[PDB]
Amino acid sequence: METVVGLTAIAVALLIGLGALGTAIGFGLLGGKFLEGAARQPEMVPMLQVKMFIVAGLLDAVTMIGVGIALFFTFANPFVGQI
Amino acid sequence: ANPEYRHPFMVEYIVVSSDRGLCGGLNINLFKSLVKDMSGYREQGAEIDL
């Protein structure tokens, strides 16, 4: 029993840690270009914010799936019942 | 295409004359026309560089 429960804590750490690593770097890359565009054309900032939010939805999509499967493995673990 | 920068020349006298004789009023008609604008700048109270 102890192995499954112990290896489910490592699974949760990887699902949230790998997601956090990618999301942080992805917004550093996307946001950096949003500041470059806003400085060049300060009158287009209202349009650039909505376009950045469209991309933000795509960037975090799989990260949000992983963080929902990690809070499911934490509360009412699906693999404990299988054994 | 580059509204990011405005050169000072895009936001708010050199006089040409001859070196020799036989000019049929060429230089006189030019100075006569210049004095009208220099006088106008002094009605406005502005200093003039030539």
PDB file of all heavy atoms in Angstrom, chain A residues 29-59:
ATOM      1  N   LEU A  29       8.232  34.918 -21.972  1.00  0.00           N
ATOM      2  CA  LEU A  29       8.412  35.100 -23.416  1.00  0.00           C
ATOM      3  C   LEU A  29       7.282  35.922 -24.047  1.00  0.00           C
ATOM      4  O   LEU A  29       7.548  36.871 -24.778  1.00  0.00           O
ATOM      5  CB  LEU A  29       8.464  33.730 -24.105  1.00  0.00           C
ATOM      6  CG  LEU A  29       9.703  32.892 -23.797  1.00  0.00           C
ATOM      7  CD1 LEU A  29       9.481  31.467 -24.285  1.00  0.00           C
ATOM      8  CD2 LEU A  29      10.939  33.460 -24.484  1.00  0.00           C
ATOM      9  N   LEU A  30       6.024  35.596 -23.751  1.00  0.00           N
ATOM     10  CA  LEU A  30       4.848  36.291 -24.276  1.00  0.00           C
ATOM     11  C   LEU A  30       4.747  37.730 -23.763  1.00  0.00           C
ATOM     12  O   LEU A  30       4.591  38.671 -24.537  1.00  0.00           O
ATOM     13  CB  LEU A  30       3.605  35.479 -23.882  1.00  0.00           C
ATOM     14  CG  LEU A  30       2.263  36.093 -24.300  1.00  0.00           C
ATOM     15  CD1 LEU A  30       2.144  36.174 -25.815  1.00  0.00           C
ATOM     16  CD2 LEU A  30       1.130  35.233 -23.765  1.00  0.00           C
ATOM     17  N   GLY A  31       4.873  37.912 -22.454  1.00  0.00           N
ATOM     18  CA  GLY A  31       4.803  39.204 -21.798  1.00  0.00           C
ATOM     19  C   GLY A  31       5.917  40.151 -22.207  1.00  0.00           C
ATOM     20  O   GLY A  31       5.688  41.345 -22.361  1.00  0.00           O
ATOM     21  N   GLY A  32       7.117  39.629 -22.435  1.00  0.00           N
ATOM     22  CA  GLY A  32       8.247  40.431 -22.890  1.00  0.00           C
ATOM     23  C   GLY A  32       7.936  41.103 -24.229  1.00  0.00           C
ATOM     24  O   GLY A  32       8.191  42.291 -24.413  1.00  0.00           O
ATOM     25  N   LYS A  33       7.330  40.364 -25.164  1.00  0.00           N
ATOM     26  CA  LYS A  33       6.905  40.887 -26.467  1.00  0.00           C
ATOM     27  C   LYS A  33       5.726  41.845 -26.335  1.00  0.00           C
ATOM     28  O   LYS A  33       5.646  42.803 -27.095  1.00  0.00           O
ATOM     29  CB  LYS A  33       6.615  39.724 -27.424  1.00  0.00           C
ATOM     30  CG  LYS A  33       7.895  39.052 -27.946  1.00  0.00           C
ATOM     31  CD  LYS A  33       8.714  39.990 -28.837  1.00  0.00           C
ATOM     32  CE  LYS A  33       9.965  39.322 -29.396  1.00  0.00           C
ATOM     33  NZ  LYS A  33      10.699  40.265 -30.281  1.00  0.00           N
ATOM     34  N   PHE A  34       4.829  41.638 -25.370  1.00  0.00           N
ATOM     35  CA  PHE A  34       3.724  42.568 -25.128  1.00  0.00           C
ATOM     36  C   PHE A  34       4.283  43.939 -24.713  1.00  0.00           C
ATOM     37  O   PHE A  34       3.826  44.954 -25.231  1.00  0.00           O
ATOM     38  CB  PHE A  34       2.765  41.982 -24.084  1.00  0.00           C
ATOM     39  CG  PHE A  34       1.748  42.953 -23.510  1.00  0.00           C
ATOM     40  CD1 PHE A  34       0.795  43.564 -24.343  1.00  0.00           C
ATOM     41  CD2 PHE A  34       1.737  43.218 -22.129  1.00  0.00           C
ATOM     42  CE1 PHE A  34      -0.145  44.459 -23.798  1.00  0.00           C
ATOM     43  CE2 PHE A  34       0.781  44.089 -21.583  1.00  0.00           C
ATOM     44  CZ  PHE A  34      -0.146  44.727 -22.421  1.00  0.00           C
ATOM     45  N   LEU A  35       5.319  43.990 -23.867  1.00  0.00           N
ATOM     46  CA  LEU A  35       5.943  45.256 -23.473  1.00  0.00           C
ATOM     47  C   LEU A  35       6.664  45.911 -24.662  1.00  0.00           C
ATOM     48  O   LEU A  35       6.554  47.117 -24.852  1.00  0.00           O
ATOM     49  CB  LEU A  35       6.922  45.040 -22.307  1.00  0.00           C
ATOM     50  CG  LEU A  35       6.290  44.539 -20.997  1.00  0.00           C
ATOM     51  CD1 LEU A  35       7.368  44.521 -19.917  1.00  0.00           C
ATOM     52  CD2 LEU A  35       5.128  45.396 -20.501  1.00  0.00           C
ATOM     53  N   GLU A  36       7.370  45.133 -25.494  1.00  0.00           N
ATOM     54  CA  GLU A  36       8.047  45.652 -26.693  1.00  0.00           C
ATOM     55  C   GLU A  36       7.032  46.302 -27.653  1.00  0.00           C
ATOM     56  O   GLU A  36       7.245  47.419 -28.118  1.00  0.00           O
ATOM     57  CB  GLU A  36       8.833  44.514 -27.376  1.00  0.00           C
ATOM     58  CG  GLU A  36       9.416  44.913 -28.741  1.00  0.00           C
ATOM     59  CD  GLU A  36      10.249  43.821 -29.442  1.00  0.00           C
ATOM     60  OE1 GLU A  36      10.601  42.780 -28.838  1.00  0.00           O
ATOM     61  OE2 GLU A  36      10.559  44.004 -30.639  1.00  0.00           O
ATOM     62  N   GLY A  37       5.899  45.646 -27.918  1.00  0.00           N
ATOM     63  CA  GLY A  37       4.860  46.190 -28.793  1.00  0.00           C
ATOM     64  C   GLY A  37       4.176  47.427 -28.206  1.00  0.00           C
ATOM     65  O   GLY A  37       3.969  48.410 -28.917  1.00  0.00           O
ATOM     66  N   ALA A  38       3.882  47.426 -26.903  1.00  0.00           N
ATOM     67  CA  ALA A  38       3.251  48.547 -26.214  1.00  0.00           C
ATOM     68  C   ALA A  38       4.139  49.802 -26.227  1.00  0.00           C
ATOM     69  O   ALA A  38       3.636  50.909 -26.386  1.00  0.00           O
ATOM     70  CB  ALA A  38       2.906  48.118 -24.784  1.00  0.00           C
ATOM     71  N   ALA A  39       5.462  49.657 -26.095  1.00  0.00           N
ATOM     72  CA  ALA A  39       6.387  50.788 -26.139  1.00  0.00           C
ATOM     73  C   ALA A  39       6.452  51.426 -27.542  1.00  0.00           C
ATOM     74  O   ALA A  39       6.530  52.649 -27.660  1.00  0.00           O
ATOM     75  CB  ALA A  39       7.765  50.314 -25.670  1.00  0.00           C
ATOM     76  N   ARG A  40       6.423  50.613 -28.607  1.00  0.00           N
ATOM     77  CA  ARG A  40       6.465  51.072 -30.005  1.00  0.00           C
ATOM     78  C   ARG A  40       5.165  51.753 -30.444  1.00  0.00           C
ATOM     79  O   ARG A  40       5.229  52.767 -31.132  1.00  0.00           O
ATOM     80  CB  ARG A  40       6.865  49.889 -30.896  1.00  0.00           C
ATOM     81  CG  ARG A  40       6.958  50.274 -32.377  1.00  0.00           C
ATOM     82  CD  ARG A  40       7.720  49.223 -33.180  1.00  0.00           C
ATOM     83  NE  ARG A  40       7.588  49.453 -34.630  1.00  0.00           N
ATOM     84  CZ  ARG A  40       8.318  50.245 -35.395  1.00  0.00           C
ATOM     85  NH1 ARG A  40       9.241  51.050 -34.957  1.00  0.00           N
ATOM     86  NH2 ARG A  40       8.136  50.251 -36.680  1.00  0.00           N
ATOM     87  N   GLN A  41       4.000  51.219 -30.074  1.00  0.00           N
ATOM     88  CA  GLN A  41       2.691  51.817 -30.388  1.00  0.00           C
ATOM     89  C   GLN A  41       1.796  51.892 -29.136  1.00  0.00           C
ATOM     90  O   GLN A  41       0.928  51.036 -28.941  1.00  0.00           O
ATOM     91  CB  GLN A  41       1.997  51.087 -31.549  1.00  0.00           C
ATOM     92  CG  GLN A  41       2.798  51.174 -32.859  1.00  0.00           C
ATOM     93  CD  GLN A  41       1.949  50.963 -34.114  1.00  0.00           C
ATOM     94  OE1 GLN A  41       0.739  50.799 -34.079  1.00  0.00           O
ATOM     95  NE2 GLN A  41       2.542  51.023 -35.287  1.00  0.00           N
ATOM     96  N   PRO A  42       1.939  52.940 -28.301  1.00  0.00           N
ATOM     97  CA  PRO A  42       1.156  53.090 -27.076  1.00  0.00           C
ATOM     98  C   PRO A  42      -0.344  53.333 -27.298  1.00  0.00           C
ATOM     99  O   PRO A  42      -1.126  53.218 -26.360  1.00  0.00           O
ATOM    100  CB  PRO A  42       1.840  54.206 -26.287  1.00  0.00           C
ATOM    101  CG  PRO A  42       2.538  55.030 -27.361  1.00  0.00           C
ATOM    102  CD  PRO A  42       2.941  53.989 -28.397  1.00  0.00           C
ATOM    103  N   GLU A  43      -0.787  53.595 -28.525  1.00  0.00           N
ATOM    104  CA  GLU A  43      -2.206  53.791 -28.855  1.00  0.00           C
ATOM    105  C   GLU A  43      -2.917  52.457 -29.147  1.00  0.00           C
ATOM    106  O   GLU A  43      -4.146  52.388 -29.091  1.00  0.00           O
ATOM    107  CB  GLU A  43      -2.361  54.718 -30.075  1.00  0.00           C
ATOM    108  CG  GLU A  43      -1.708  56.107 -29.942  1.00  0.00           C
ATOM    109  CD  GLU A  43      -0.182  56.147 -30.159  1.00  0.00           C
ATOM    110  OE1 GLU A  43       0.427  55.117 -30.532  1.00  0.00           O
ATOM    111  OE2 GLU A  43       0.406  57.238 -29.970  1.00  0.00           O
ATOM    112  N   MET A  44      -2.164  51.387 -29.429  1.00  0.00           N
ATOM    113  CA  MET A  44      -2.685  50.046 -29.734  1.00  0.00           C
ATOM    114  C   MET A  44      -2.744  49.111 -28.516  1.00  0.00           C
ATOM    115  O   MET A  44      -3.217  47.981 -28.620  1.00  0.00           O
ATOM    116  CB  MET A  44      -1.915  49.415 -30.907  1.00  0.00           C
ATOM    117  CG  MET A  44      -1.974  50.263 -32.182  1.00  0.00           C
ATOM    118  SD  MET A  44      -3.667  50.553 -32.771  1.00  0.00           S
ATOM    119  CE  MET A  44      -3.327  51.728 -34.104  1.00  0.00           C
ATOM    120  N   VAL A  45      -2.334  49.588 -27.340  1.00  0.00           N
ATOM    121  CA  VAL A  45      -2.327  48.824 -26.084  1.00  0.00           C
ATOM    122  C   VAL A  45      -3.676  48.150 -25.761  1.00  0.00           C
ATOM    123  O   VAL A  45      -3.648  46.984 -25.364  1.00  0.00           O
ATOM    124  CB  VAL A  45      -1.817  49.718 -24.937  1.00  0.00           C
ATOM    125  CG1 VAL A  45      -1.897  49.053 -23.566  1.00  0.00           C
ATOM    126  CG2 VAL A  45      -0.348  50.071 -25.174  1.00  0.00           C
ATOM    127  N   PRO A  46      -4.854  48.784 -25.938  1.00  0.00           N
ATOM    128  CA  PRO A  46      -6.140  48.126 -25.686  1.00  0.00           C
ATOM    129  C   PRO A  46      -6.327  46.854 -26.529  1.00  0.00           C
ATOM    130  O   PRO A  46      -6.826  45.839 -26.042  1.00  0.00           O
ATOM    131  CB  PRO A  46      -7.211  49.164 -26.047  1.00  0.00           C
ATOM    132  CG  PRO A  46      -6.497  50.493 -25.827  1.00  0.00           C
ATOM    133  CD  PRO A  46      -5.069  50.187 -26.263  1.00  0.00           C
ATOM    134  N   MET A  47      -5.902  46.900 -27.794  1.00  0.00           N
ATOM    135  CA  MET A  47      -5.984  45.773 -28.720  1.00  0.00           C
ATOM    136  C   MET A  47      -4.933  44.710 -28.369  1.00  0.00           C
ATOM    137  O   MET A  47      -5.246  43.523 -28.325  1.00  0.00           O
ATOM    138  CB  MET A  47      -5.861  46.299 -30.157  1.00  0.00           C
ATOM    139  CG  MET A  47      -5.948  45.188 -31.213  1.00  0.00           C
ATOM    140  SD  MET A  47      -4.403  44.376 -31.725  1.00  0.00           S
ATOM    141  CE  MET A  47      -3.378  45.783 -32.224  1.00  0.00           C
ATOM    142  N   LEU A  48      -3.703  45.109 -28.031  1.00  0.00           N
ATOM    143  CA  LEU A  48      -2.662  44.149 -27.663  1.00  0.00           C
ATOM    144  C   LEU A  48      -3.010  43.377 -26.375  1.00  0.00           C
ATOM    145  O   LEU A  48      -2.753  42.179 -26.320  1.00  0.00           O
ATOM    146  CB  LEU A  48      -1.294  44.844 -27.553  1.00  0.00           C
ATOM    147  CG  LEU A  48      -0.747  45.427 -28.869  1.00  0.00           C
ATOM    148  CD1 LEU A  48       0.551  46.186 -28.589  1.00  0.00           C
ATOM    149  CD2 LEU A  48      -0.462  44.368 -29.930  1.00  0.00           C
ATOM    150  N   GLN A  49      -3.645  43.994 -25.366  1.00  0.00           N
ATOM    151  CA  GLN A  49      -4.068  43.283 -24.156  1.00  0.00           C
ATOM    152  C   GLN A  49      -5.052  42.162 -24.482  1.00  0.00           C
ATOM    153  O   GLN A  49      -4.849  41.040 -24.033  1.00  0.00           O
ATOM    154  CB  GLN A  49      -4.731  44.223 -23.141  1.00  0.00           C
ATOM    155  CG  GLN A  49      -3.717  44.926 -22.233  1.00  0.00           C
ATOM    156  CD  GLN A  49      -4.269  45.409 -20.891  1.00  0.00           C
ATOM    157  OE1 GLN A  49      -3.559  46.001 -20.095  1.00  0.00           O
ATOM    158  NE2 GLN A  49      -5.529  45.225 -20.567  1.00  0.00           N
ATOM    159  N   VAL A  50      -6.102  42.423 -25.273  1.00  0.00           N
ATOM    160  CA  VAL A  50      -7.052  41.362 -25.623  1.00  0.00           C
ATOM    161  C   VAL A  50      -6.348  40.273 -26.426  1.00  0.00           C
ATOM    162  O   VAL A  50      -6.523  39.100 -26.108  1.00  0.00           O
ATOM    163  CB  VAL A  50      -8.353  41.885 -26.262  1.00  0.00           C
ATOM    164  CG1 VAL A  50      -8.160  42.746 -27.501  1.00  0.00           C
ATOM    165  CG2 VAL A  50      -9.286  40.739 -26.654  1.00  0.00           C
ATOM    166  N   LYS A  51      -5.478  40.607 -27.388  1.00  0.00           N
ATOM    167  CA  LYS A  51      -4.734  39.592 -28.156  1.00  0.00           C
ATOM    168  C   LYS A  51      -3.800  38.778 -27.259  1.00  0.00           C
ATOM    169  O   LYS A  51      -3.714  37.570 -27.439  1.00  0.00           O
ATOM    170  CB  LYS A  51      -4.008  40.216 -29.355  1.00  0.00           C
ATOM    171  CG  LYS A  51      -4.940  40.857 -30.397  1.00  0.00           C
ATOM    172  CD  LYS A  51      -6.040  39.924 -30.911  1.00  0.00           C
ATOM    173  CE  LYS A  51      -6.929  40.670 -31.903  1.00  0.00           C
ATOM    174  NZ  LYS A  51      -8.081  39.838 -32.323  1.00  0.00           N
ATOM    175  N   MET A  52      -3.149  39.381 -26.266  1.00  0.00           N
ATOM    176  CA  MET A  52      -2.316  38.647 -25.316  1.00  0.00           C
ATOM    177  C   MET A  52      -3.173  37.669 -24.502  1.00  0.00           C
ATOM    178  O   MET A  52      -2.764  36.533 -24.306  1.00  0.00           O
ATOM    179  CB  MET A  52      -1.561  39.609 -24.394  1.00  0.00           C
ATOM    180  CG  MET A  52      -0.677  38.818 -23.428  1.00  0.00           C
ATOM    181  SD  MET A  52       0.240  39.777 -22.220  1.00  0.00           S
ATOM    182  CE  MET A  52      -1.117  40.468 -21.230  1.00  0.00           C
ATOM    183  N   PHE A  53      -4.364  38.071 -24.044  1.00  0.00           N
ATOM    184  CA  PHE A  53      -5.256  37.175 -23.306  1.00  0.00           C
ATOM    185  C   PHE A  53      -5.747  36.004 -24.171  1.00  0.00           C
ATOM    186  O   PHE A  53      -5.925  34.912 -23.643  1.00  0.00           O
ATOM    187  CB  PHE A  53      -6.387  37.947 -22.622  1.00  0.00           C
ATOM    188  CG  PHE A  53      -5.941  38.900 -21.524  1.00  0.00           C
ATOM    189  CD1 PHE A  53      -6.470  40.197 -21.456  1.00  0.00           C
ATOM    190  CD2 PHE A  53      -5.028  38.479 -20.536  1.00  0.00           C
ATOM    191  CE1 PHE A  53      -6.075  41.075 -20.428  1.00  0.00           C
ATOM    192  CE2 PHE A  53      -4.631  39.355 -19.513  1.00  0.00           C
ATOM    193  CZ  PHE A  53      -5.148  40.656 -19.460  1.00  0.00           C
ATOM    194  N   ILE A  54      -5.952  36.174 -25.483  1.00  0.00           N
ATOM    195  CA  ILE A  54      -6.304  35.045 -26.364  1.00  0.00           C
ATOM    196  C   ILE A  54      -5.178  34.002 -26.306  1.00  0.00           C
ATOM    197  O   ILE A  54      -5.439  32.822 -26.087  1.00  0.00           O
ATOM    198  CB  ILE A  54      -6.584  35.481 -27.820  1.00  0.00           C
ATOM    199  CG1 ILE A  54      -7.756  36.471 -27.961  1.00  0.00           C
ATOM    200  CG2 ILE A  54      -6.817  34.282 -28.748  1.00  0.00           C
ATOM    201  CD1 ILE A  54      -9.084  36.001 -27.363  1.00  0.00           C
ATOM    202  N   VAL A  55      -3.924  34.428 -26.464  1.00  0.00           N
ATOM    203  CA  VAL A  55      -2.755  33.540 -26.401  1.00  0.00           C
ATOM    204  C   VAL A  55      -2.579  32.939 -25.005  1.00  0.00           C
ATOM    205  O   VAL A  55      -2.277  31.757 -24.893  1.00  0.00           O
ATOM    206  CB  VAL A  55      -1.480  34.271 -26.834  1.00  0.00           C
ATOM    207  CG1 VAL A  55      -0.242  33.383 -26.710  1.00  0.00           C
ATOM    208  CG2 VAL A  55      -1.571  34.746 -28.286  1.00  0.00           C
ATOM    209  N   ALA A  56      -2.815  33.698 -23.934  1.00  0.00           N
ATOM    210  CA  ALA A  56      -2.700  33.218 -22.556  1.00  0.00           C
ATOM    211  C   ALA A  56      -3.601  32.000 -22.305  1.00  0.00           C
ATOM    212  O   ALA A  56      -3.218  31.075 -21.597  1.00  0.00           O
ATOM    213  CB  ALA A  56      -3.034  34.363 -21.598  1.00  0.00           C
ATOM    214  N   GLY A  57      -4.791  31.970 -22.912  1.00  0.00           N
ATOM    215  CA  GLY A  57      -5.712  30.843 -22.811  1.00  0.00           C
ATOM    216  C   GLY A  57      -5.099  29.574 -23.409  1.00  0.00           C
ATOM    217  O   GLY A  57      -5.195  28.509 -22.815  1.00  0.00           O
ATOM    218  N   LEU A  58      -4.467  29.674 -24.581  1.00  0.00           N
ATOM    219  CA  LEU A  58      -3.771  28.559 -25.230  1.00  0.00           C
ATOM    220  C   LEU A  58      -2.547  28.088 -24.429  1.00  0.00           C
ATOM    221  O   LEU A  58      -2.305  26.891 -24.314  1.00  0.00           O
ATOM    222  CB  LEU A  58      -3.313  28.966 -26.641  1.00  0.00           C
ATOM    223  CG  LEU A  58      -4.428  29.424 -27.588  1.00  0.00           C
ATOM    224  CD1 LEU A  58      -3.826  30.078 -28.829  1.00  0.00           C
ATOM    225  CD2 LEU A  58      -5.288  28.243 -28.032  1.00  0.00           C
ATOM    226  N   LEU A  59      -1.790  29.024 -23.854  1.00  0.00           N
ATOM    227  CA  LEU A  59      -0.526  28.779 -23.171  1.00  0.00           C
ATOM    228  C   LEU A  59      -0.751  27.969 -21.889  1.00  0.00           C
ATOM    229  O   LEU A  59      -0.044  26.995 -21.653  1.00  0.00           O
ATOM    230  CB  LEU A  59       0.134  30.150 -22.952  1.00  0.00           C
ATOM    231  CG  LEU A  59       1.583  30.142 -22.455  1.00  0.00           C
ATOM    232  CD1 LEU A  59       2.231  31.463 -22.848  1.00  0.00           C
ATOM    233  CD2 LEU A  59       1.760  29.963 -20.958  1.00  0.00           C
TER     234      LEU A  59
END
